[PDB]
Write an enzyme that holds these catalytic residues in place. Structure first.
Site, PDB file in Angstrom:
ATOM      1  CB  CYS A   7      37.193  46.140  45.090  1.00 25.31           C
ATOM      2  SG  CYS A   7      38.858  46.859  45.110  1.00 25.31           S
ATOM      3  CG  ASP A 126      36.704  49.833  35.779  1.00 25.98           C
ATOM      4  OD1 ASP A 126      35.564  49.374  35.808  1.00 25.98           O
ATOM      5  OD2 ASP A 126      37.011  50.677  36.617  1.00 25.98           O
TER       6      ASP A 126
HETATM    7  O1  LIG Z   1      34.701  51.665  44.179  1.00 26.14           O
HETATM    8  C1  LIG Z   1      35.071  52.820  44.056  1.00 26.14           C
HETATM    9  O2  LIG Z   1      34.410  53.776  44.436  1.00 26.14           O
HETATM   10  C2  LIG Z   1      36.359  53.059  43.410  1.00 26.14           C
HETATM   11  C3  LIG Z   1      36.709  54.388  43.283  1.00 26.14           C
HETATM   12  C4  LIG Z   1      37.904  54.691  42.683  1.00 26.14           C
HETATM   13  C5  LIG Z   1      38.729  53.673  42.220  1.00 26.14           C
HETATM   14  C6  LIG Z   1      38.398  52.323  42.329  1.00 26.14           C
HETATM   15  C7  LIG Z   1      37.218  51.941  42.921  1.00 26.14           C
HETATM   16  N1  LIG Z   1      36.924  50.608  43.018  1.00 26.14           N
HETATM   17  C8  LIG Z   1      37.865  49.681  42.797  1.00 26.14           C
HETATM   18  C9  LIG Z   1      37.654  48.547  41.790  1.00 26.14           C
HETATM   19  O3  LIG Z   1      38.552  48.589  40.699  1.00 26.14           O
HETATM   20  C10 LIG Z   1      36.192  48.629  41.377  1.00 26.14           C
HETATM   21  O4  LIG Z   1      35.546  47.573  42.064  1.00 26.14           O
HETATM   22  C11 LIG Z   1      35.588  48.377  40.015  1.00 26.14           C
HETATM   23  O5  LIG Z   1      35.949  49.286  39.003  1.00 26.14           O
HETATM   24  C12 LIG Z   1      34.112  48.649  40.287  1.00 26.14           C
HETATM   25  O6  LIG Z   1      33.299  47.646  39.771  1.00 26.14           O
HETATM   26  P1  LIG Z   1      31.728  47.811  40.008  1.00 26.14           P
HETATM   27  O7  LIG Z   1      31.366  46.913  41.159  1.00 26.14           O
HETATM   28  O8  LIG Z   1      31.341  49.231  40.326  1.00 26.14           O
HETATM   29  O9  LIG Z   1      31.283  47.300  38.679  1.00 26.14           O
END
Ligand SMILES: O=C(O)c1ccccc1NC[C@H](O)[C@H](O)[C@H](O)COP(=O)(O)O
Length: 194
Positions: A7, A126
């Site tokens: 993502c 999440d």
């Molecule tokens: O990545 C962002 O900044 C963001 C911000 C707002 C909403 C969703 C987002 N990311 C989208 C996706 O759902 C995210 O990858 C995960 O929640 C983040 O996983 P992480 O890599 O931080 O553990």
């Protein structure tokens, strides 16, 4: 075998690298306050140049249904990830035209009880103690495991839960908005068992 979504893609080169390494989906964050934010126009360019058989997902946070639908047809999305506090109605309306994935933040079993209200849609949890999801696994159709995943821990998290997919964005980054190809290679290599 587990599916992998990368993502917060903000440039072509990172997306393509992702595809060639085995990623099944690529995501764009349409939330204006994210550091990983990308405009529909810039996203369109990337979407359009990607091969088929790779999902294009767009993350929205409490956006109004019409804006969600327009960005989706413009950028040619395959799914919509509703990452705010959207009620099932909004979810159900969006879902009449395109596939939606509901994101839900989780930290204790009270949160898992909130998640069960959306069990008719695919869930992105999440989030860490993976085993607390276990007693709820079979109440859901398709489950996307997310939160704090990185090359070093994905396999453990996959063994405990056995989810449909796994999602990640900062855990394979060099800095906000820019992926680190070695981490991506390793994340996919490890999550899929290649
Ligand atoms: O990545 C962002 O900044 C963001 C911000 C707002 C909403 C969703 C987002 N990311 C989208 C996706 O759902 C995210 O990858 C995960 O929640 C983040 O996983 P992480 O890599 O931080 O553990």
């Amino acid at each position: 075998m587990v599916r992998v979504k990368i993502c917060g893609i903000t440039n072509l080169e990172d997306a393509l690298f992702s595809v060639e390494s085995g990623a099944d989906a690529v995501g764009f964050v349409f939330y204006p306050k994210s550091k990983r934010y990308i405009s529909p126009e810039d996203a369109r360019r990337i979407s359009v140049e990607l091969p088929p058989f790779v999902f294009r997902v767009g993350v929205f946070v409490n956006e109004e249904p019409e804006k969600i639908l327009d960005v989706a047809s413009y950028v040619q999305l395959n799914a919509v990830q509703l990452h705010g506090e959207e009620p099932i109605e909004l979810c159900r309306k969006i879902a009449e035209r395109i596939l939606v994935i509901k994101a839900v933040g989780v930290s204790n079993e009270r949160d898992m009880e909130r998640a069960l209200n959306y069990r008719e849609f695919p869930i992105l949890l999440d989030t860490f103690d993976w085993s607390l999801i276990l007693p709820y696994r079979d109440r859901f159709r398709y489950l996307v495991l997310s939160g704090g995943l990185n090359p070093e821990n994905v396999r453990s998290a996959i063994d405990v839960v056995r989810p449909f997919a796994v999602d990640v964005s900062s855990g394979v980054e060099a800095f906000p908005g820019k992926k680190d190809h070695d981490s991506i290679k390793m994340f996919i290599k490890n999550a899929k068992g290649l």
